[PDB]
Swiss-Prot record, chains A, B, C:
Chain's role: Promotes microtubule assembly and stability, and might be involved in the establishment and maintenance of neuronal polarity. The C-terminus binds axonal microtubules while the N-terminus binds neural plasma membrane components, suggesting that tau functions as a linker protein between both. Axonal polarity is predetermined by TAU/MAPT localization (in the neuronal cell) in the domain of the cell body defined by the centrosome. The short isoforms allow plasticity of the cytoskeleton whereas the longer isoforms may preferentially play a role in its stabilization.
Protein name (Swiss-Prot/TrEMBL): Microtubule-associated protein tau
Residues flagged as site, Not glycated: K1, K17, K21, K25, K38, K44, K48, K58, K67, K70, K97, K102
Tau/MAP repeats: 2-32, 33-63, 64-95
Modified positions (Phosphoserine) in chain numbering: S12, S20, S32, S51, S79, S83
Subunit-structure text: Interacts with MARK1, MARK2, MARK3 and MARK4. Interacts with PSMC2 through SQSTM1. Interacts with SQSTM1 when polyubiquitinated. Interacts with FKBP4. Binds to CSNK1D. Interacts with SGK1. Interacts with PIN1. Interacts with LRRK2. Interacts with LRP1, leading to endocytosis; this interaction is reduced in the presence of LRPAP1/RAP.
Organism annotation: Homo sapiens (Human)
Positions of modified residues (Omega-N-methylarginine): R76
Phylogenetic classification of the source organism: Eukaryota, Metazoa, Chordata, Craniata, Vertebrata
Subcellular localization, as worded in the UniProt entry: Cytoplasm, Cytosol; Cell membrane; Cytoplasm, Cytoskeleton; Cell projection, Axon
Deamidated asparagine modifications at: N6
Glycyl lysine isopeptide (Lys-Gly) (interchain with G-Cter in ubiquitin) crosslink location in chain: K8, K25, K38, K44, K48, K58, K70, K74, K80, K96, K102
Region span, Microtubule-binding domain: 1-95
Domain remarks in the Swiss-Prot or TrEMBL record: The tau/MAP repeat binds to tubulin. Type I isoforms contain 3 repeats while type II isoforms contain 4 repeats.
Full-protein residues shown: 591 to 697 of 758
Superkingdom of origin: Eukaryota
Protein backbone atom coordinates (compact mmCIF):
# COMPACT_ATOMS: atom_id res chain seq x y z
CA UNK A 1 0.00 0.00 0.00
CA UNK A 2 3.07 2.20 0.38
CA UNK A 3 6.03 1.25 -1.79
CA UNK A 4 8.84 3.73 -1.40
CA UNK A 5 11.40 2.44 -3.89
CA UNK A 6 14.62 4.40 -4.02
CA UNK A 7 17.09 3.00 -6.53
CA UNK A 8 19.99 4.10 -8.57
CA UNK A 9 20.20 1.57 -11.43
CA UNK A 10 17.34 -0.80 -12.21
CA UNK A 11 18.10 -2.66 -15.46
CA UNK A 12 21.13 -0.80 -16.62
CA UNK A 13 24.41 -1.21 -18.46
CA UNK A 14 26.96 1.43 -17.47
CA UNK A 15 30.54 2.04 -18.54
CA UNK A 16 31.62 4.98 -16.41
CA UNK A 17 35.01 6.68 -16.94
CA UNK A 18 35.89 3.63 -18.91
CA UNK A 19 39.06 3.19 -20.93
CA UNK A 20 40.39 6.72 -20.65
CA UNK A 21 43.24 9.04 -19.67
CA UNK A 22 46.10 6.96 -21.04
CA UNK A 23 49.36 8.32 -22.40
CA UNK A 24 50.29 6.16 -25.39
CA UNK A 25 53.68 6.98 -26.88
CA UNK A 26 56.00 5.61 -29.53
CA UNK A 27 59.51 6.94 -30.07
CA UNK A 28 61.29 4.52 -32.42
CA UNK A 29 64.64 4.55 -34.08
CA UNK A 30 63.03 2.98 -37.11
CA UNK A 31 60.96 0.18 -38.55
CA UNK A 32 58.70 -0.29 -35.54
CA UNK A 33 55.01 -1.09 -35.15
CA UNK A 34 52.86 -0.03 -32.22
CA UNK A 35 49.25 -1.19 -32.16
CA UNK A 36 46.90 -0.30 -29.34
CA UNK A 37 43.67 -2.13 -30.03
CA UNK A 38 41.50 -0.26 -27.53
CA UNK A 39 37.75 -0.29 -28.20
CA UNK A 40 35.13 0.30 -25.57
CA UNK A 41 32.07 -1.67 -26.62
CA UNK A 42 28.67 -2.08 -25.06
CA UNK A 43 25.99 -4.28 -26.58
CA UNK A 44 22.51 -5.47 -25.73
CA UNK A 45 21.27 -8.04 -28.21
CA UNK A 46 17.79 -9.52 -27.78
CA UNK A 47 17.15 -11.79 -30.74
CA UNK A 48 13.93 -13.75 -30.35
CA UNK A 49 13.31 -16.28 -33.09
CA UNK A 50 10.02 -17.69 -34.26
CA UNK A 51 9.11 -21.22 -35.19
CA UNK A 52 11.35 -21.73 -38.24
CA UNK A 53 13.51 -18.63 -38.54
CA UNK A 54 17.23 -18.09 -38.95
CA UNK A 55 18.89 -15.22 -37.12
CA UNK A 56 22.51 -14.65 -38.13
CA UNK A 57 23.67 -11.98 -35.71
CA UNK A 58 27.20 -11.46 -37.07
CA UNK A 59 28.35 -7.89 -36.35
CA UNK A 60 32.09 -8.41 -36.90
CA UNK A 61 34.82 -6.33 -35.40
CA UNK A 62 38.12 -4.61 -35.91
CA UNK A 63 40.70 -6.07 -38.26
CA UNK A 64 44.01 -4.24 -38.05
CA UNK A 65 46.65 -5.55 -40.44
CA UNK A 66 50.18 -4.37 -41.14
CA UNK A 67 52.18 -5.97 -43.92
CA UNK A 68 55.65 -5.06 -45.12
CA UNK A 69 57.30 -6.90 -47.98
CA UNK A 70 60.67 -5.15 -47.86
CA UNK A 71 62.33 -2.55 -45.63
CA UNK A 72 65.99 -1.53 -45.48
CA UNK A 73 68.28 0.64 -43.36
CA UNK A 74 71.68 1.19 -44.92
CA UNK A 75 73.30 3.13 -42.06
CA UNK A 76 73.40 3.82 -38.34
CA UNK A 77 70.05 4.25 -36.63
CA UNK A 78 70.90 6.44 -33.65
CA UNK A 79 68.38 8.01 -31.26
CA UNK A 80 69.62 9.91 -28.22
CA UNK A 81 66.82 10.86 -25.84
CA UNK A 82 67.29 13.21 -22.93
CA UNK A 83 63.81 12.88 -21.46
CA UNK A 84 60.16 12.37 -22.29
CA UNK A 85 56.90 13.42 -20.62
CA UNK A 86 58.08 15.58 -17.72
CA UNK A 87 54.70 15.56 -16.02
CA UNK A 88 54.06 17.34 -12.71
CA UNK A 89 50.64 16.77 -11.14
CA UNK A 90 49.96 18.80 -7.98
CA UNK A 91 46.27 19.03 -6.98
CA UNK A 92 44.99 20.90 -3.96
CA UNK A 93 43.14 19.59 -0.96
CA UNK A 94 40.05 20.16 1.12
CA UNK A 95 37.94 18.30 -1.41
CA UNK A 96 34.58 17.01 -0.21
CA UNK A 97 32.37 14.41 -1.90
CA UNK A 98 29.21 14.10 0.17
CA UNK A 99 26.66 11.59 -1.15
CA UNK A 100 23.74 11.53 1.27
CA UNK A 101 20.78 9.21 0.66
CA UNK A 102 18.17 9.79 3.31
CA UNK A 103 14.65 8.36 3.55
CA UNK A 104 11.89 8.79 6.11
CA UNK A 105 8.53 7.25 6.86
CA UNK A 106 6.44 8.80 9.64
CA UNK A 107 2.91 8.97 10.99
CA UNK B 1 -1.83 2.99 -3.32
CA UNK B 2 1.22 5.22 -2.89
CA UNK B 3 4.21 4.30 -5.04
CA UNK B 4 7.00 6.80 -4.61
CA UNK B 5 9.59 5.54 -7.09
CA UNK B 6 12.79 7.53 -7.17
CA UNK B 7 15.30 6.16 -9.66
CA UNK B 8 18.21 7.30 -11.67
CA UNK B 9 18.47 4.79 -14.54
CA UNK B 10 15.63 2.41 -15.37
CA UNK B 11 16.45 0.57 -18.62
CA UNK B 12 19.47 2.45 -19.74
CA UNK B 13 22.77 2.09 -21.55
CA UNK B 14 25.29 4.74 -20.51
CA UNK B 15 28.87 5.38 -21.55
CA UNK B 16 29.91 8.32 -19.39
CA UNK B 17 33.30 10.05 -19.88
CA UNK B 18 34.21 7.01 -21.86
CA UNK B 19 37.41 6.61 -23.84
CA UNK B 20 38.71 10.15 -23.53
CA UNK B 21 41.53 12.49 -22.51
CA UNK B 22 44.42 10.44 -23.87
CA UNK B 23 47.68 11.84 -25.19
CA UNK B 24 48.66 9.70 -28.18
CA UNK B 25 52.05 10.55 -29.64
CA UNK B 26 54.41 9.22 -32.27
CA UNK B 27 57.91 10.58 -32.77
CA UNK B 28 59.74 8.19 -35.12
CA UNK B 29 63.10 8.25 -36.74
CA UNK B 30 61.54 6.69 -39.80
CA UNK B 31 59.50 3.88 -41.28
CA UNK B 32 57.21 3.38 -38.29
CA UNK B 33 53.53 2.54 -37.94
CA UNK B 34 51.34 3.57 -35.03
CA UNK B 35 47.74 2.38 -35.01
CA UNK B 36 45.36 3.24 -32.21
CA UNK B 37 42.14 1.38 -32.94
CA UNK B 38 39.93 3.22 -30.45
CA UNK B 39 36.19 3.17 -31.15
CA UNK B 40 33.54 3.72 -28.55
CA UNK B 41 30.51 1.73 -29.63
CA UNK B 42 27.09 1.29 -28.11
CA UNK B 43 24.45 -0.92 -29.67
CA UNK B 44 20.98 -2.14 -28.86
CA UNK B 45 19.78 -4.71 -31.37
CA UNK B 46 16.31 -6.22 -30.98
CA UNK B 47 15.71 -8.48 -33.96
CA UNK B 48 12.51 -10.46 -33.61
CA UNK B 49 11.93 -12.99 -36.37
CA UNK B 50 8.66 -14.41 -37.58
CA UNK B 51 7.79 -17.95 -38.53
CA UNK B 52 10.06 -18.42 -41.57
CA UNK B 53 12.21 -15.31 -41.84
CA UNK B 54 15.92 -14.73 -42.20
CA UNK B 55 17.55 -11.86 -40.34
CA UNK B 56 21.16 -11.25 -41.31
CA UNK B 57 22.28 -8.59 -38.87
CA UNK B 58 25.81 -8.04 -40.19
CA UNK B 59 26.94 -4.46 -39.44
CA UNK B 60 30.68 -4.94 -39.95
CA UNK B 61 33.39 -2.85 -38.41
CA UNK B 62 36.67 -1.10 -38.88
CA UNK B 63 39.28 -2.53 -41.22
CA UNK B 64 42.58 -0.67 -40.96
CA UNK B 65 45.25 -1.95 -43.33
CA UNK B 66 48.78 -0.73 -44.00
CA UNK B 67 50.82 -2.31 -46.76
CA UNK B 68 54.30 -1.36 -47.92
CA UNK B 69 55.98 -3.18 -50.78
CA UNK B 70 59.34 -1.39 -50.61
CA UNK B 71 60.96 1.20 -48.35
CA UNK B 72 64.61 2.25 -48.16
CA UNK B 73 66.86 4.42 -46.01
CA UNK B 74 70.27 5.01 -47.53
CA UNK B 75 71.85 6.95 -44.65
CA UNK B 76 71.91 7.61 -40.92
CA UNK B 77 68.53 8.01 -39.24
CA UNK B 78 69.35 10.19 -36.24
CA UNK B 79 66.79 11.72 -33.87
CA UNK B 80 67.99 13.61 -30.80
CA UNK B 81 65.15 14.53 -28.44
CA UNK B 82 65.58 16.86 -25.52
CA UNK B 83 62.09 16.50 -24.08
CA UNK B 84 58.45 15.97 -24.96
CA UNK B 85 55.16 16.98 -23.31
CA UNK B 86 56.30 19.13 -20.39
CA UNK B 87 52.90 19.08 -18.71
CA UNK B 88 52.22 20.84 -15.40
CA UNK B 89 48.79 20.23 -13.87
CA UNK B 90 48.05 22.23 -10.71
CA UNK B 91 44.36 22.43 -9.73
CA UNK B 92 43.04 24.27 -6.72
CA UNK B 93 41.16 22.92 -3.75
CA UNK B 94 38.05 23.47 -1.70
CA UNK B 95 35.98 21.60 -4.26
CA UNK B 96 32.62 20.28 -3.09
CA UNK B 97 30.44 17.67 -4.82
CA UNK B 98 27.27 17.33 -2.79
CA UNK B 99 24.75 14.80 -4.15
CA UNK B 100 21.81 14.70 -1.75
CA UNK B 101 18.87 12.37 -2.41
CA UNK B 102 16.23 12.91 0.23
CA UNK B 103 12.72 11.45 0.42
CA UNK B 104 9.94 11.84 2.96
CA UNK B 105 6.58 10.27 3.67
CA UNK B 106 4.45 11.79 6.43
CA UNK B 107 0.91 11.92 7.75
CA UNK C 1 1.81 -2.93 3.25
CA UNK C 2 4.90 -0.76 3.60
CA UNK C 3 7.84 -1.75 1.41
CA UNK C 4 10.68 0.71 1.77
CA UNK C 5 13.20 -0.62 -0.74
CA UNK C 6 16.44 1.31 -0.90
CA UNK C 7 18.88 -0.13 -3.42
CA UNK C 8 21.77 0.93 -5.49
CA UNK C 9 21.93 -1.61 -8.33
CA UNK C 10 19.05 -3.95 -9.08
CA UNK C 11 19.77 -5.84 -12.33
CA UNK C 12 22.81 -4.01 -13.52
CA UNK C 13 26.07 -4.46 -15.38
CA UNK C 14 28.65 -1.84 -14.42
CA UNK C 15 32.23 -1.27 -15.52
CA UNK C 16 33.35 1.68 -13.42
CA UNK C 17 36.76 3.34 -13.98
CA UNK C 18 37.59 0.27 -15.94
CA UNK C 19 40.74 -0.21 -17.98
CA UNK C 20 42.11 3.31 -17.73
CA UNK C 21 44.98 5.61 -16.78
CA UNK C 22 47.82 3.50 -18.16
CA UNK C 23 51.08 4.82 -19.55
CA UNK C 24 51.97 2.63 -22.54
CA UNK C 25 55.35 3.41 -24.06
CA UNK C 26 57.64 2.01 -26.72
CA UNK C 27 61.15 3.31 -27.30
CA UNK C 28 62.90 0.86 -29.65
CA UNK C 29 66.23 0.85 -31.33
CA UNK C 30 64.59 -0.72 -34.34
CA UNK C 31 62.47 -3.51 -35.75
CA UNK C 32 60.23 -3.94 -32.72
CA UNK C 33 56.54 -4.71 -32.30
CA UNK C 34 54.43 -3.61 -29.36
CA UNK C 35 50.80 -4.74 -29.27
CA UNK C 36 48.48 -3.81 -26.44
CA UNK C 37 45.23 -5.62 -27.09
CA UNK C 38 43.09 -3.72 -24.59
CA UNK C 39 39.34 -3.71 -25.23
CA UNK C 40 36.75 -3.09 -22.58
CA UNK C 41 33.66 -5.04 -23.60
CA UNK C 42 30.27 -5.40 -22.01
CA UNK C 43 27.56 -7.58 -23.50
CA UNK C 44 24.08 -8.73 -22.61
CA UNK C 45 22.79 -11.30 -25.08
CA UNK C 46 19.31 -12.75 -24.61
CA UNK C 47 18.62 -15.03 -27.56
CA UNK C 48 15.38 -16.95 -27.13
CA UNK C 49 14.72 -19.49 -29.85
CA UNK C 50 11.41 -20.88 -30.99
CA UNK C 51 10.46 -24.41 -31.89
CA UNK C 52 12.67 -24.95 -34.96
CA UNK C 53 14.86 -21.88 -35.30
CA UNK C 54 18.58 -21.37 -35.73
CA UNK C 55 20.28 -18.50 -33.93
CA UNK C 56 23.89 -17.98 -34.97
CA UNK C 57 25.10 -15.31 -32.58
CA UNK C 58 28.62 -14.83 -33.96
CA UNK C 59 29.82 -11.27 -33.27
CA UNK C 60 33.54 -11.82 -33.84
CA UNK C 61 36.31 -9.76 -32.37
CA UNK C 62 39.61 -8.07 -32.92
CA UNK C 63 42.16 -9.57 -35.28
CA UNK C 64 45.49 -7.76 -35.10
CA UNK C 65 48.10 -9.12 -37.50
CA UNK C 66 51.63 -7.97 -38.24
CA UNK C 67 53.60 -9.61 -41.02
CA UNK C 68 57.07 -8.73 -42.25
CA UNK C 69 58.68 -10.60 -45.12
CA UNK C 70 62.07 -8.88 -45.03
CA UNK C 71 63.77 -6.29 -42.82
CA UNK C 72 67.44 -5.30 -42.71
CA UNK C 73 69.76 -3.14 -40.62
CA UNK C 74 73.16 -2.63 -42.21
CA UNK C 75 74.82 -0.69 -39.37
CA UNK C 76 74.96 0.01 -35.65
CA UNK C 77 71.61 0.48 -33.91
CA UNK C 78 72.52 2.69 -30.95
CA UNK C 79 70.03 4.28 -28.56
CA UNK C 80 71.31 6.19 -25.53
CA UNK C 81 68.53 7.17 -23.13
CA UNK C 82 69.05 9.53 -20.24
CA UNK C 83 65.58 9.24 -18.74
CA UNK C 84 61.92 8.76 -19.55
CA UNK C 85 58.68 9.85 -17.86
CA UNK C 86 59.90 12.01 -14.98
CA UNK C 87 56.53 12.04 -13.25
CA UNK C 88 55.93 13.84 -9.94
CA UNK C 89 52.52 13.31 -8.35
CA UNK C 90 51.88 15.36 -5.20
CA UNK C 91 48.21 15.63 -4.16
CA UNK C 92 46.97 17.53 -1.15
CA UNK C 93 45.12 16.24 1.88
CA UNK C 94 42.05 16.86 3.97
CA UNK C 95 39.90 15.00 1.47
CA UNK C 96 36.54 13.75 2.71
CA UNK C 97 34.30 11.16 1.04
CA UNK C 98 31.15 10.90 3.13
CA UNK C 99 28.57 8.40 1.85
CA UNK C 100 25.67 8.38 4.29
CA UNK C 101 22.68 6.09 3.71
CA UNK C 102 20.09 6.70 6.38
CA UNK C 103 16.57 5.31 6.65
CA UNK C 104 13.83 5.78 9.23
CA UNK C 105 10.46 4.27 10.02
CA UNK C 106 8.41 5.85 12.80
CA UNK C 107 4.89 6.06 14.18
Amino acid sequence: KVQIINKKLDLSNVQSKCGSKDNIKHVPGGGSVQIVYKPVDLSKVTSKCGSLGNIHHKPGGGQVEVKSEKLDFKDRVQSKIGSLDNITHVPGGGNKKIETHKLTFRE
